[PDB]
Design a protein around this motif. Sequence first.
Motif, PDB file in Angstrom:
ATOM      1  N   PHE A   7      39.795  30.935  27.901  1.00  0.00           N
ATOM      2  CA  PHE A   7      39.101  30.648  28.381  1.00  0.00           C
ATOM      3  C   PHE A   7      38.345  29.030  28.046  1.00  0.00           C
ATOM      4  N   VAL A  12      35.388  26.389  34.479  1.00  0.00           N
ATOM      5  CA  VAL A  12      35.822  28.207  34.213  1.00  0.00           C
ATOM      6  C   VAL A  12      35.164  28.465  33.829  1.00  0.00           C
ATOM      7  N   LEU A  13      34.645  28.463  32.320  1.00  0.00           N
ATOM      8  CA  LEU A  13      33.337  29.475  32.285  1.00  0.00           C
ATOM      9  C   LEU A  13      31.972  28.978  32.906  1.00  0.00           C
ATOM     10  N   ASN A  89      29.928  30.673  35.334  1.00  0.00           N
ATOM     11  CA  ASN A  89      30.916  31.285  36.347  1.00  0.00           C
ATOM     12  C   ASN A  89      30.492  32.673  36.229  1.00  0.00           C
ATOM     13  N   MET A  92      33.355  34.910  36.280  1.00  0.00           N
ATOM     14  CA  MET A  92      34.838  34.738  34.652  1.00  0.00           C
ATOM     15  C   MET A  92      33.867  35.709  33.917  1.00  0.00           C
ATOM     16  N   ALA A  95      34.716  39.214  33.599  1.00  0.00           N
ATOM     17  CA  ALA A  95      36.753  39.271  33.515  1.00  0.00           C
ATOM     18  C   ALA A  95      36.635  38.784  31.985  1.00  0.00           C
ATOM     19  N   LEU A 170      43.551  30.325  30.352  1.00  0.00           N
ATOM     20  CA  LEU A 170      43.093  29.920  31.663  1.00  0.00           C
ATOM     21  C   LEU A 170      42.442  28.503  31.548  1.00  0.00           C
ATOM     22  N   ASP A 172      41.870  24.725  34.452  1.00  0.00           N
ATOM     23  CA  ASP A 172      41.330  24.254  35.319  1.00  0.00           C
ATOM     24  C   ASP A 172      42.578  22.696  35.353  1.00  0.00           C
ATOM     25  N   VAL A 190      43.128  27.868  37.404  1.00  0.00           N
ATOM     26  CA  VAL A 190      42.006  27.852  37.443  1.00  0.00           C
ATOM     27  C   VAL A 190      40.892  27.034  39.195  1.00  0.00           C
ATOM     28  N   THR A 193      37.871  30.675  41.689  1.00  0.00           N
ATOM     29  CA  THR A 193      37.452  31.933  41.025  1.00  0.00           C
ATOM     30  C   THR A 193      38.452  33.114  40.408  1.00  0.00           C
ATOM     31  N   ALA A 196      41.921  32.663  40.188  1.00  0.00           N
ATOM     32  CA  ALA A 196      42.106  32.871  38.833  1.00  0.00           C
ATOM     33  C   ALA A 196      42.353  34.667  38.355  1.00  0.00           C
ATOM     34  N   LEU A 197      41.310  35.086  38.842  1.00  0.00           N
ATOM     35  CA  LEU A 197      40.672  36.863  38.636  1.00  0.00           C
ATOM     36  C   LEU A 197      41.925  37.592  38.670  1.00  0.00           C
TER      37      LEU A 197
END
Lengths: 534, 534
Positions: A7, A12-13, A89, A92, A95, A170, A172, A190, A193, A196-197
């Motif tokens: 990630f 993203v995170l 996030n 994220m 996940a 993953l 962005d 991404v 969210t 992406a998930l």
Amino acid sequence: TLRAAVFDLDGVLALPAVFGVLGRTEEALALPRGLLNDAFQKGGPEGATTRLMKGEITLSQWIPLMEENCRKFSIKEIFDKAISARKINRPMLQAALMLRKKGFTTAILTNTWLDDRAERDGLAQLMCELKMHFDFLIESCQVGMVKPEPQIYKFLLDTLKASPSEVVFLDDIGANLKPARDLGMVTILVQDTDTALKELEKVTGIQLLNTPAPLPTSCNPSDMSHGYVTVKPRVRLHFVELGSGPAVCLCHGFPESWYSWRYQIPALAQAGYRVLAMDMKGYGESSAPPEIEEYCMEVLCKEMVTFLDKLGLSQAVFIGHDWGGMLVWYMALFYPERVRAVASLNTPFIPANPNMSPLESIKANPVFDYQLYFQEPGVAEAELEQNLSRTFKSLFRASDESVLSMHKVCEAGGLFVNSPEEPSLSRMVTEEEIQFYVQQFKKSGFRGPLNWYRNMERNWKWACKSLGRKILIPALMVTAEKDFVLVPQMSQHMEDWIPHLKRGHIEDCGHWTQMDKPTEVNQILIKWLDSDAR
Amino acid sequence: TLRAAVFDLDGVLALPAVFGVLGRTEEALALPRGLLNDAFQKGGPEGATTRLMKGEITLSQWIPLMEENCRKFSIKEIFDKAISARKINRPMLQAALMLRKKGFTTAILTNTWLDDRAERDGLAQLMCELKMHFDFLIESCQVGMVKPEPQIYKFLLDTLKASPSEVVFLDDIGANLKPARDLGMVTILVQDTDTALKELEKVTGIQLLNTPAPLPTSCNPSDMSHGYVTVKPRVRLHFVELGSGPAVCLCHGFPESWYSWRYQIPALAQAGYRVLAMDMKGYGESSAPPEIEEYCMEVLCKEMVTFLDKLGLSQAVFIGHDWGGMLVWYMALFYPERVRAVASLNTPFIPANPNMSPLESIKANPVFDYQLYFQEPGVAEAELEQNLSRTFKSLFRASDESVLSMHKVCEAGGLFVNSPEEPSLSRMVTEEEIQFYVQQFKKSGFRGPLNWYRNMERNWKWACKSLGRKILIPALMVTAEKDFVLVPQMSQHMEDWIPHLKRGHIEDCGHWTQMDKPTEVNQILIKWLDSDAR
Ligand SMILES: O=C(NCCC(c1ccccc1)c1ccccc1)n1cccc1
Ligand SMILES: O=C(NCCC(c1ccccc1)c1ccccc1)n1cccc1
């Protein structure tokens, strides 16, 4: 076949992306479109930003170089605000946690800088919370390479010890996904969210979206800072320590461990507190002298004051559960100058009855029969030490999983007499968590822990000296709806002794409060700490 | 023949006396003389104040009862100010310390209360600083007895395990001295400190007044909180921990210990900091893996970051001496987001020369010859491990006590070749302090510590990556006039790399800065910490 998940951090995170602030600023200041974002990328691989991201220069060195690029209002101010606004996030991370829980190797691969700003701590705290949930954290400024250079991707694979086809990546930034895609890694652009998930759960075959609320972060015993204080010649106290801020001393019950606070330790440290999770006297790595007198409340409390003295702590907030809760109320009554605030889970504050022996008082309540069974030295030890796995599995269960009758224990001649030899594992605990308690109790057994019950008269005489006092320091009483021994109604008279008492109540919660309802315990404690314990 | 000394707190070990505030208030508010002081003593042994001093009620319960007595403006406000103003009577404590140092048993015997005020911490901190310098602290509110009742005096003697004639008792209240006098104890009415101390030195035959400045409080290893963090499978780090507040990580040099900070640990904790005194990798209770690579600066620094991660600390101020000082500058260069502030004793910040091998650079300075002697695995270990007492006694000496020549060590084939087999004990250390280092080095020897010198090329290549950076976080460089290896002039160019560098300089100070000049080290560090490290 996927076995690793990678990630990005920004966008993203962590959200909102720091990259999308230069554009936000342009719009707010009505500046020509892309002006700031162009200054940010000026010179490309030779430019100031690439040098920053490779670790050649620090953020404070880059700030004036960016300002010179902008002159194609403060760059520092814009970035200070962008970094402060950027938060984890949570879905994220959820996940990534589920993927690692399922056996995936996880990593954060990020283009970042060496932050030497006066306000660098905010980001330091964020990286700390995030990184501990991943197998690896690869930062561009430490490795001297940046995305989209192909070398950082080969470095990622060598670090993961995985072939590209085993890795989902993953990001962005589309340009940063291209080299991973070219190598044969599964990639996810991404944007939002949720999408992406959906892409992530489709490629992995693991449900990641709409999943139930996860349990709070727990503790791996081998990854904690372990502390040891000698309080007197033959007595040392062990504790687990995590976080910074006001000291919060956690006191477990019978027959427990510091580990009984596993769900609270990371949450309270994250909340801004310095957590000291005790192995109470007689337990785990703490000393277990055999004498009964060594476990009366007066000596236990005196040793907890010495523990603070030796650590150089003038105060600590004291939070106890069960026997630990009983100790914390006495700490508040006898040493208020050393108790910043006091909180008890399940255990009410009940003043000593000076017109009745504690033996008589215990005989009055049928639920407390097990306490009379615990009096004779050696009898309860034998039963509880016979099979440790059976003891913990039989004890540690939710309100609806009961295998034990705590009524007519004496008459039946045992706590586990009409209880199974091989109890089923409770839904509150794993086999590994039971085995941790098993291994802990192999050191000293149940003598020291049971000695906590063998000082009734001694504790009664000491408690009577406090009958003219009131608890006037900040105090919290947390009741558990389904604790059938430490019933919520037993606490009904507490404000006669603690007028300013604050409360918390957990519905559908058994005796083992911390592990039965971890999320709600943490919510109640953090809220109370921030309002009443500074 | 005297062997025990007893001191009161109010008006004796702490000044100004809280008792002399009721009169101060009367004068300031032009109230009828003795009005407030009479309300304070209303009812005598049956009164509210006696109940308070016996521990029957708390200070917050007593406040309104005092107000009712006064009505024969706030009692709380008057007492809050009186307690805050009351500070340790440093010359009285100095006398108590000298008496205990000479073999006397010492005790504080005080009429005090159970403090549950919102501001109770101030007093809690005072009692903490004071009590740790005494064998016993007897408080009226804990023992349920008050001076002048004769029972508290019999309790004092039983606690001291001494006959009255062996005890000197100091008090500012004449009525409180009478029962001790009647029992045959030597008594001192304390009005002004100087007179009380003249009386004290006359009866004891020990010089207590006009004596030289004592050394700062040191550490007894067995009385510290000892912490252990596993940073990776085969590596755990040990540290000693004391105090609360911002984390201050202390990093020793070669061939030292956490104990090398013994004079700083209590002072920095007292100053309002959370001190973490390390046993660096290869030393004492920390792991000492044999591989040379395990001790390059990159790995050492990475493990110190993991140490912070595991403890839940986003930052720490890093203070190092000698090799520890070298590590702290690299911590600041490679992990500024984790370093709140950086300070070095003796060790200058010298950037790597990219146009010269570190081997060549070391050969350029004749004082650094011992470093080439240290290169070959096993040679320096053999000499330093041959006789540990000789190693430490020969090494740990003041600028004027030198027995060692660090020039032509290789040519002479040893660091101690023309050095004595039985060195005299340096004035900086006791035999017991030398034996602590001896016992510590018996665990792992000198392999791990010497491996710190065996990574020159590795450290040089890593340091070169930082050549474009500047140290812009708060920084302190402390120079020692008489360190003949880490000379003050070696630091002359530091502000080219650290523009905002702050400095400290210790005159007539050798290499072993912390023990050579403890008082001045503490003064420099505390001043810098409070101004630059929050
Ligand atoms: O006996 C006490 N707690 C143990 C209760 C526990 C237990 C009882 C008997 C054995 C072990 C553990 C329990 C387990 C399940 C449900 C309710 C309660 N206390 C006495 C004063 C403060 C606590
Ligand atoms: O060699 C280093 N320090 C040890 C000096 C010490 C010593 C030298 C040799 C052996 C042991 C200890 C010393 C002792 C006395 C006087 C000055 C210096 N450094 C190298 C980079 C940073 C420190």
